[PDB]
């Protein structure tokens, strides 16, 4: 039955739009799936619920005093395709750890047993910028077995992908957390599809799909909607279908192999986004060259 | 004498390039300044030192076993303008808190007394994506009195700016941490200079300067250099001069006034980057409109 999935990736590469869409495309193949957003900002469940920003567990637990005083119907809410939704809340700015927000919401969902009710999939939307103990909480507490890293042909998204992968490495031994695959979200930078496959092979995983840059996306967004919900017929919808399909069919759950900075930098130079280091000119003024 | 400064801001808006440059332009007016990078990645001191990536305290303390076994000359290193430099190191991926890395490096710098040696300024390069207790460590432990938030006319950078501001609010009472001003780093999106000044006034601070988009920057970067060091004569160098000047002359250290999501969203719509919400179409398919 059920699979415990989590999607990681750097901020602003389109982690939530890939997640919400493939989950809507998964639930177009009639799956009860649940999205749990771990991100400070409530942007991780909004497109399914046609909402602006779902209420978070840190918001509502402030209102009722504690988490047990929260009643599930107004915590977890369903939208398109009966896809269940919970935005967990960030840290109290400058003071709390992000981890806490995530853990209390897992516990509230195991406690009021929405985890064992019928669901074929659970998905955690998790930021991969800092891969600290806090954001690695679903990995540490063995709540996410299948990590799907969203990225693109750009240094920082790759860095992120690799550093998320070092965290899978540490909890390989303690549990069953394993990397599924990378998902390349096109930046329209030149031969990025190739680059991310190179990385995927150097880590020992696959670049499970290449999601394109489409305007479709922001057309659907003005309506606070998923692409799958706005126009079922655009090939963007069938991209997310190809991924949503490829996701359930995957049986490659490697225990990845992280690379050096230098090794990563190779990839970037080799595929043209990063330039090549001419050492002649280093440390030399407008004059000296 | 000495001022304890920290520059916060979202990832990839150019927090480290603004910081390293204005610090090089501050040290062009002959100041002994020290940069301490708190970021996981060692990209926060590299342009001063003509290096690729300075060694971090978490890296070297792994080598010698503990922090006391570290000798200061190969921890803190100086580059252009006798500007002292220390990259503190990130969390061990998936396990550590970022906070720890920062705190051990403050303590090592107070312990081996580089804090009380001659310096007119100290600067902490700190990521503003997650404003959790970890990244708020120099604010919590009253090591940074003057927060300078770098941002731009874009939602997330603003969000960030505001949330960093909520953290200043919480430690207003306990200490002397106060917000200096915002710095707008041009994205070349249309009337962003105006937008960030609106925010600065709604927070009760000023948009201390508007740093432009220049190609100069990446020309200097191929040499692993600051703009101030590559061509002292470009008006980009005199922008950083205008900021480096404006920074020491500032005596506006407000205890900011954070805004609503809705209130922030106003700004964006009012200044044209965000659109306006037509509710007619919300939750309605390719067909229904
Ligand atoms: N495939 C895509 N094509 C075009 N824009 C996209 C695509 N996926 C996401 N985006 C856009 O990128 C921006 C950020 O997306 P988001 O999913 O919110 O990122 P994140 O989760 O990494 O913070 C928004 O404009 C989003 O609609
Ligand atoms: N004023 C500027 N004009 C143009 N590009 C800039 C400017 N400041 C920074 N950048 C560029 O933005 C990118 C990220 O800068 P960086 O300082 O490394 O960001 P960060 O510290 O927020 O991660 C690099 O191309 C950097 O050179
Ligand atoms: S573990 Fe990470 S989320 Fe928690 S306080 Fe540290 S840096 Fe923040
Ligand atoms: Mg999000
Ligand atoms: Mg940096």
Curated annotation (Swiss-Prot), chains A, B:
ATP binds at residues 9-16. The keyword Metal-binding applies. Induction: Constitutively expressed during log and stationary phase in sucrose-limited cultures, its levels decrease during stationary phase (at protein level). The modification ADP-ribosylarginine is found at residue 100. Keywords: 4Fe-4S, ADP-ribosylation, ATP-binding, Iron, Iron-sulfur, Metal-binding, Nitrogen fixation, Nucleotide-binding, Oxidoreductase. The keyword Iron applies. It catalyses: N2 + 8 reduced [2Fe-2S]-[ferredoxin] + 16 ATP + 16 H2O = H2 + 8 oxidized [2Fe-2S]-[ferredoxin] + 2 NH4(+) + 16 ADP + 16 phosphate + 6 H(+). Binds 1 [4Fe-4S] cluster per dimer. Signal peptide: none annotated. GO terms for molecular function: 4 iron, 4 sulfur cluster binding; ATP binding; metal ion binding; nitrogenase activity. [4Fe-4S] cluster binds at residues 97, 132. Nitrogenase holoenzyme is subject to 'conformational protection' by FeSII; under oxidizing conditions FeSII binds to the holoenzyme and reversibly protects it from oxidation. PROSITE patterns: NIFH_FRXC_1, NIFH_FRXC_2, NIFH_FRXC_3. InterPro entries: NifH/chlL_CS (IPR030655), NifH/frxC (IPR000392), Nitrogenase_Fe_NifH (IPR005977), P-loop_NTPase (IPR027417). The reversible ADP-ribosylation of Arg-100 inactivates the nitrogenase reductase and regulates nitrogenase activity. The key enzymatic reactions in nitrogen fixation are catalyzed by the nitrogenase complex, which has 2 components: the iron protein (component 2) and a component 1 which is either a molybdenum-iron protein, a vanadium-iron, or an iron-iron protein. This subunit is associated with the molybdenum-iron nitrogenase component 2. PANTHER family: LIGHT-INDEPENDENT PROTOCHLOROPHYLLIDE REDUCTASE IRON-SULFUR ATP-BINDING PROTEIN. HAMAP family: NifH (MF_00533). Belongs to the NifH/BchL/ChlL family. NCBIfam families: nifH. This is Nitrogenase iron protein 1. It comes from Azotobacter vinelandii.
């Amino acid at each position: 039955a059920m699979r415990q999935c989590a999607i990681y990736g750097k901020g602003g590469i389109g982690k939530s739009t890939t997640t919400q869409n493939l989950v809507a495309a998964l639930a177009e193949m009639g799956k009860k799936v649940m999205i749990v957003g771990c991100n400070p900002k409530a942007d991780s469940t909004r497109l399914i619920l046609h909402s602006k920003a779902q209420n978070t567990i840190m918001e509502m637990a402030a209102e009722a005093g504690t988490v047990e005083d929260l009643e599930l119907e107004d915590v977890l809410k369903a939208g398109y395709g009966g896809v269940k939704c919970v935005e967990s809340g960030g840290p109290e700015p400058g003071v709390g750890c992000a981890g806490r927000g995530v853990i209390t919401a897992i516990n509230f969902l195991e406690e009021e047993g929405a985890y064992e009710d019928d669901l074929d999939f659970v998905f955690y939307d998790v930021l991969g910028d800092v891969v600290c103990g806090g954001f690695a909480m679903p990995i540490r507490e063995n709540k996410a077995q299948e990590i799907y890293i969203v990225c693109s042909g750009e240094m920082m998204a790759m860095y992120a992908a690799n550093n998320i992968s070092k965290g899978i490495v540490k909890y390989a031994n303690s549990g069953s957390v394993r990397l599924g695959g990378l998902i390349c979200n096109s930046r329209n930078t030149d031969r990025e599809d190739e680059l991310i496959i190179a990385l995927a092979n150097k880590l020992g995983t696959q670049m499970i799909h290449f999601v394109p840059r489409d305007n479709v996306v922001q057309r659907a967004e003005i309506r606070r909607m998923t692409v799958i919900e706005y126009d079922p017929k655009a090939k963007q919808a069938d991209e997310y279908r190809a991924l949503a399909r490829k996701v359930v069919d995957n049986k490659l759950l490697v225990i990845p192999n992280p690379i050096t900075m230098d090794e990563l930098e190779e990839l970037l130079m080799e595929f043209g986004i990063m330039e090549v280091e001419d050492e002649s000119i280093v440390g030399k003024t407008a004059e000296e060259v």
